[PDB]
RNA sequence: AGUUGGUGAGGUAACGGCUCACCAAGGCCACGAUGCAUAGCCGACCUGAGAGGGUGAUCGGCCACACUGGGACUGAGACA
RNA sequence: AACCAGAAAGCCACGGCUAACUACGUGCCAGCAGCCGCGGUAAUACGUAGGUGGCAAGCGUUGUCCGGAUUUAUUGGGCGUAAAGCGAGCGCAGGCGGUUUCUUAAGUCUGAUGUGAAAGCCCCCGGCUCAACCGGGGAGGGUCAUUGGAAACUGGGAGAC
């Protein structure tokens, strides 16, 4: 839901394209922005935008992707459990991992993994490769984790019997 | 021609042996029917290891252990015990 | 397919081809056999070299030979650095890489390593077109 | 070949003292080369691996072929952090020892030291430098010829010992005290940037 | 024709869950009352009552929710489906969401849970997963 | 005697020689990969001294030793006889 | 078309169409016979998250060949 | 034990993929390239020079096999318009099957024994100044063979709806 700003925070320019429009006459060209912003510790977002030129246009989507911030639950620095995440042709896997290993994924999604505080995972892209729904796949990804507590408290039993 | 004897295992200098019963037309380190402990020529005092059960059946049933053989199981009461407990009944 | 299909069904692949087949002999002795002998290179004798052009929207001439190969296989090479000594009626290597720009050919020779001299100027590569250190 | 750089370039490059512990600093903010005193582009995330590893290693003066084998020696301890197990083992060989102990105040002179078989460990001559050290063998100095001026004059340079180290400065012995960690073992480069290095490798 | 009504009862509280509305209504019979007596136990279903008049039939089921209007059986799959049957061995015993989840077997002895089979050295063919 | 040979049992296909009948075998297998349970099947061969068995019929053997080129089985009892 | 089965004989370390005389028409095939084409087989090596895929050189085990194609003698053991 | 810093460093590359830049030279010629593509007067892409980076007694090029390929999809793909539902039916063989009682135990799980040569890969220990290497001792691999159990599932037998 909407979360405030009263942390710090990473930014980290993923990619920008100059991007046209054609009018009579000759093309006008724009450059828009991708940018996620996290406190490595649990919470991250990503926002976009466009402009004339590419330091307003950065500060732009700086500036939009502060108003998403996901959750991410955690436990030792590694993913919950086992998780899939798809968005029109983003297919993301991701897997927990051993201690100290170190992360195993593609570009884009490493900035996201990164910036919400992960230390050790693993993921394989499959299908698409463009900056942008690679990222929302993965962000819907990460909306999936359950969590050990959620569901002691969902289902009747508690904790340390579900095991 | 069951007959027990050497085999040699060591790399270009330091040899190694391994007391082994085969048949006798086998090559020198080809085939066998089974191991009987070992022994090290190098670093003297020669260690020997050997069981003492296989080697008292397969003289039993009958098997002539070559020179260097014989000389390693006389040092370790295995001749002895043989020629003991046989040709008394 | 339902797992009953596949179960009848071969379930087949499409098996790929090679970049090089002049390499790979069609053998010629005594009787004119088969091939098992995926060499990385092999020899011939140049039958006529000259330059030839390229196709657009390149420009130069290029400047090639043609050779036959001991394995009974024409085959139209190229020959690479500035300049050369290659004439009709003389053995040399070959060596497997396309060219793009120019159609036709998919061989090229190696300089220095046979009857042809290697490039006679060069300071900075000299591992490849085969040219020897200089020591002054 | 083992080393020839001017130890400078090393240091100046990656940017940390490597190992004087006290920067040479004069044009040293920037890197060597005609294109060091103006800044550039950023550095890929390729490149920044490739500096914490580059950097992992002229620390010691080892090989390439040499530096994958000692990873994935490592690689097998089945507890801890594979990045820090690795950093340990890359403690005990003998060179580092040497530096370690104070008997020379360059990985160099420690190399030419335990590679012209001035020292021992235990009593008998050992000079392979890429020795493996194990905990608690207490490495001796070969004191037939320790007569010579840069052995006494290092040692006197008792500046520090870190809380793994105990050697006296009288018959020159030293030891190992345990395995060492993290929070004191030349802090401060990654551990996770090597760590990933090696799955692209 | 129903040729495999195990997955027609999983497909149900799928889609009925799916909706979100609150009870269902299936023909009865041997192992669906089993299947749904432990998917009773594990806190997954609220309620289910058996009725019976001169055939098969009916299970009623009522689903489970949470208080802030969430799901709590977030979805359903059937594994050994016919036309091609999936057994296990006790050294193979599956295990679905590092435990968060359950798998339920047929073992030799009855059906039940997974880590039942786990601390029994059991094998079995299982029957479906569910999250 | 101390042990026993390959007793298979099977239904007869056909019977038209003398002393000598043609039991067929019968039994499932898994795929390979797949883990669909095909089934093939065998044609043996077996000796019946006095033509007792008739076609359709399920019966058990037992293996002998070369009793024929290709005919070395033996027959036992004609367990559920058919008609 | 000795193909498949039977009766009998002969033969072999040894059962048997292995070979002979007589009798009856069988046998195998879509669950791939017959034909055509390539290869000696295995312990293993290379790669791969894994399922798998590709190779059978050094070392061990087996089979088969000795200029090409036939035959047998001596012998416990060879068609050497 | 003696004597000498003395006899002992090359190779590829620097436009993006990819780590590492500027002069001079030539001017769609010479030429280069794995793919994008560079070369018609101020070329980080061609040639030399000087710097830099990667490896180092090695370094590059070719040829071949697996990978990345989820591009034969069992794990693990699809068929409205992108390649792809036969023009439609009738149907032998085959694949798959309503619900319940008793039964059997082929498929299934599980127990004991034999067996899966030695050398290999792996685990522990040990010996050459360490390392390759060598040595001892353990596991792994069957869809195997024999023998004993269980009865939910599928299959076979006698039933009832």
Redesign the pocket.
């Known amino acids: 839901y909407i979360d405030p700003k009263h942390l710090e925070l990473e930014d980290r320019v993923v990619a920008i394209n100059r991007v046209t429009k054609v009018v009579k006459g000759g093309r006008r060209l724009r450059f828009a922005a991708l940018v996620v912003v996290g406190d490595k510790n649990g919470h991250v977002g990503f926002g976009t935008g466009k402009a004339q030129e590419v330091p307003e246009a950065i500060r732009k989507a700086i500036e939009d992707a502060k108003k998403n911030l996901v959750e991410v639950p955690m436990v030792g620095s590694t993913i919950p459990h086992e998780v899939i995440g798809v968005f029109g042709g983003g297919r993301i896997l991701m897997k927990p991992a051993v201690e100290g290993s170190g992360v195993a994924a593609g570009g884009p999604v490493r900035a996201v993994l990164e910036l919400a505080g992960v230390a050790d995972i693993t993921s394989k892209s499959?299908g698409s490769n463009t900056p942008i729904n690679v990222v929302r796949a993965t962000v819907e990804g990460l909306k999936q984790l359950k969590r050990a507590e959620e569901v002691a408290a969902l289902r009747g039993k508690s904790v340390e019997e579900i095991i | 021609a069951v007959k027990i004897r050497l085999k040699r295992?060591?790399?270009k200098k330091?040899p190694?042996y391994?007391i082994v019963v085969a048949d006798s037309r086998?090559?020198r380190?080809?085939?066998f029917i089974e191991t009987v402990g070992?022994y090290n020529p190098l670093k003297d005092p020669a260690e020997v290891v050997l069981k003492e059960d296989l080697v008292l059946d397969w003289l039993s049933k009958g098997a002539q252990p070559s020179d260097t053989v014989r000389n390693i199981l006389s040092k370790e009461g295995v001749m002895k015990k043989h020629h003991e407990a046989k040709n008394v009944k | 397919?339902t797992?009953?299909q596949?179960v009848r069904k071969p379930?087949?692949?499409?098996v790929e081809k090679?970049?090089?087949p002049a390499?790979n002999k069609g053998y010629n002795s005594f009787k004119k056999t088969?091939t098992n002998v995926?060499?990385?290179?092999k020899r011939g004798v140049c039958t006529r070299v000259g330059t030839m052009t390229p196709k657009k929207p390149?420009?130069?001439?290029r400047?090639y030979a043609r050779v036959r190969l001991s394995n009974l296989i024409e085959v139209t090479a190229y020959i690479?650095?500035?300049?050369h000594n290659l004439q009709e009626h003389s053995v040399v290597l070959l060596?497997?890489?396309?060219?793009?720009?120019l159609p036709g050919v998919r061989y090229h020779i190696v300089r220095g390593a046979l009857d042809t001299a290697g490039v006679n100027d060069?300071?900075?590569?000299?591992?490849?077109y085969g040219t020897k250190?200089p020591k002054a | 070949?083992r080393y020839?750089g001017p130890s400078w370039?090393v240091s100046r490059?990656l940017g940390i003292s490597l190992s004087g512990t006290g920067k040479e600093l004069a044009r040293r903010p920037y890197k060597?080369?005609?294109?060091g005193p103006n800044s550039?582009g950023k550095?890929?995330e390729?490149?920044m691996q490739?500096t914490e590893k580059?950097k992992l290693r002229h620390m010691y003066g080892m090989?390439?072929?040499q530096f994958r084998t000692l990873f994935i020696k490592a690689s097998?301890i089945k507890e801890g952090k594979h990045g820090v197990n690795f950093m340990v083992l890359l403690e005990q060989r003998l060179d580092n020892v040497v530096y370690r102990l104070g008997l020379a105040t360059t990985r160099r002179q420690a190399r030419q030291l335990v590679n012209h078989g001035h020292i021992t460990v235990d009593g008998k001559?050992?000079?392979?430098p890429?020795?493996?050290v194990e905990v608690g063998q207490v490495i001796g100095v070969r004191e037939k010829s320790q007569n010579i001026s840069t052995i006494k004059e290092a040692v006197e340079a008792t500046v520090g010992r870190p809380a793994f180290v105990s050697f006296d400065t009288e018959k020159l012995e030293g030891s190992f005290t345990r395995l060492p960690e993290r929070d004191e073992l030349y802090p401060e480069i990654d551990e996770a940037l090597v760590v990933e290095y090696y799955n692209q490798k | 024709?129903?040729?495999d009504?195990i997955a027609d009862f999983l497909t149900r509280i799928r889609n009925a869950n799916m909706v979100k509305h609150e009870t269902l209504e299936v023909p009865a019979?041997?192992?669906k009352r089993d299947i749904a007596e432990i998917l009773k136990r594990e806190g997954f279903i609220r309620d289910v009552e058996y009725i019976e008049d001169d055939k098969?039939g009916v299970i009623r089921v009522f689903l489970k929710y949470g208080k802030n209007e969430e799901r709590v059986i977030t979805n359903l799959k059937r594994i050994s489906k016919?036309?091609l049957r999936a057994?296990v061995?006790?050294?193979e015993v599956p295990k679905v969401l590092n435990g968060l989840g359950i798998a339920i077997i047929?073992?030799?002895?009855?059906?039940i849970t997974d880590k039942e089979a786990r601390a029994k050295?059991?094998?079995?063919?299982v029957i479906a997963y569910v999250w | 005697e101390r042990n026993q040979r390959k007793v298979y049992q099977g239904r007869v296909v056909?019977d038209?020689?003398?002393?000598?009948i043609?039991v067929v075998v019968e039994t499932k297998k898994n795929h390979p990969?797949?883990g669909k349970?095909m089934?093939?099947?065998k044609?043996y061969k077996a000796?019946d001294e006095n033509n007792t068995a008739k076609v359709g019929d399920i019966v058990k053997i037992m293996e002998t030793?070369?009793?024929?080129?290709?005919?070395r089985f033996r027959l036992l009892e004609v367990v559920e006889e058919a008609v």
Do not use: W
Not at chain 6, 65 to 71: E, M, V
């Open positions: 499959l | 295992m060591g790399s330091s190694f391994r086998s090559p380190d080809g085939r070992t | 397919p797992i009953n596949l379930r087949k692949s499409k090679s970049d090089s390499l088969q995926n060499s990385p290179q390149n420009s130069a001439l400047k690479p650095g500035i300049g060596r497997g890489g396309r060219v793009k720009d060069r300071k900075q590569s000299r591992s490849k250190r | 070949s020839t370039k490059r060597p080369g005609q294109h550039r550095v890929s390729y490149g490739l580059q090989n390439e072929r097998k001559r050992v000079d392979i890429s020795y493996h | 024709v129903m040729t009504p019979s041997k192992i098969q016919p036309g057994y061995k006790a050294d047929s073992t030799s002895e009855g059906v050295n059991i094998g079995g063919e | 056909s038209k020689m003398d002393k000598t043609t990969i797949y349970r089934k093939y099947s044609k000796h030793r070369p009793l024929s080129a290709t005919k």
